[PDB]
Structure 1
Amino acid sequence: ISRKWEKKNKIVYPPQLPGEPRRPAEIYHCRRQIKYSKDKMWYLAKLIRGMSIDQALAQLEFNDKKGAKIIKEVLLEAQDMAVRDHNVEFRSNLYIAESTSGRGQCLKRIRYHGRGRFGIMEKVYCHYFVKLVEGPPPPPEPPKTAVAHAKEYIQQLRSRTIVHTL
C-alpha cells in the first residue's frame, strides 16, 4: 500500500519574515478502507469540492448516502484537528481545496450463477481524501463574457502570420 497523505500534515515550514503574506493553513485528512464504492464516493467528493466547511457539512447532513455520512465524520474530524493542532483561529474559516476517492484493498468472493457457472464478486473498499485550507472559499471562476470571447478572436485575427514565406 501507500500512505503518503498522512505524512503531509507533518511538513514544518521555515519561519516567515515579517513582511510576507500570512501563509494559509493546510490540513490533510483521510479515511482508509471504507466499505463503499470509490465511484459513488466520487460523486459525494465532487459535490463537496470548493465549498465552505459549513456549507459542505450542510449538504452532507441532508444527502441520503452512506458515503455522505462517512464524509461528514471525516470533515468534522479534520475541522477539529484544524483548530486543535494546526493553529487555525476560526473553525468556520476553512474550505475544501481537494476532495477525491481512491480504490482500497478489496476481496474476491464467488457468486454462484446457474448451470455450473460462477462469477467472482468484489467486496469493494475505498479511501476518502480531504485537504482543508484556511480562508473563505475562493471566488468561483465567472463565465466568459462576449467581450472576452471577442478579444480572444481579435487577438487571433492579429496573431496570424504569413505562412511558408520569408
Structure 2
Amino acid sequence: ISRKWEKKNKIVYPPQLPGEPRRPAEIYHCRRQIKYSKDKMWYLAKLIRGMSIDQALAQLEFNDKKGAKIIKEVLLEAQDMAVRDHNVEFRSNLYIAESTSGRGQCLKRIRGIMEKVYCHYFVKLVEGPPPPPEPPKTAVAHAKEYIQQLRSRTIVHTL
C-alpha cells in the first residue's frame, strides 16, 4: 500500500514574480479499491488521456462499461476540488493530463483459488485547453530528416 497520489496535492510552490508565466493548476485525484480489473479499466483510462474534462465526461456517460461510471464520478469530484480547493476559476478549463489504472489488493477465494480483483484509478487534471495533437509528419519532414541523416555520415574507421 503506497498513497503518494494523495500527497501530490499538498505541494506548495513558492509565489511567482510578475514577469513570469502563470503556472497552470495541477490537480491529482484517485479512487482506490474498485471492484474492477485493471486491464479492463486501462481502456477507459486510455480513452480520455488528452481530452478536455467536458469531452471526457461526454464520452464516459455513453460507454456501456462498468468502469465508465466510476471514472465519471472521479472526474466530477476532481473538477469540484479543482474549482473549490485548487483555485481553478473555470470548470471547463481542465484537461486529463494523466489517466492510468493500477492493481489493488486483490482477494483470494477458494472454489481452486480464484482472485477477486480490485484496482485503482488515477487521474491528473491541468488547467487550460487540451494540448493539440501532434500533426502527422509531412513528406517535407521526412525528406528533411533523410537529408540530415545523409549529411551526418562520416568517413568511418580512418583518420
The interval holding the TM-score normalised by the smaller chain is over 0.9
Q: How much has 1:120 moved relative to structure 2?
A: 1.1
Deviations 1:77-101 (A, max 9, x none): 0000000100001000000000000
Q: TM-score, normalised by structure 1?
A: 0.94
Runs of 4+ in structure 1 over 4 Å off: none
Partner residue of 2:148 out of 129, 135, 155: 155
Q: SS at 2:9's partner residue?
A: helix
CA distance in 1, matches of 2:41, 2:58: 17
Q: Which residue of 2 aligns with 1:144?
A: 137
Aligned residue pairs total: 158
CA distance in 1, matches of 2:149, 2:49: 34
Unaligned runs of 5+ in 2: none
CA distance in 2, matches of 1:158, 1:19: 41
CA distance in 1, matches of 2:149, 2:71: 46
Q: SS at 2:74's partner residue?
A: helix
Deviations 1:60-79 (A, max 9, x none): 00000110000000000000
**Structure with max Cα Rg:** 1
Q: SS at 2:71's partner residue?
A: helix
CA distance in 1, matches of 2:150, 2:87: 52
Cα RMSD over matched residues? 0.4
Q: SS at 1:141's partner residue?
A: coil
CA distance in 2, matches of 1:123, 1:136: 39
Deviations 1:126-157 (A, max 9, x none): 00000000000001000010000000000011
Q: How much has 1:107 moved relative to structure 2?
A: 0.6
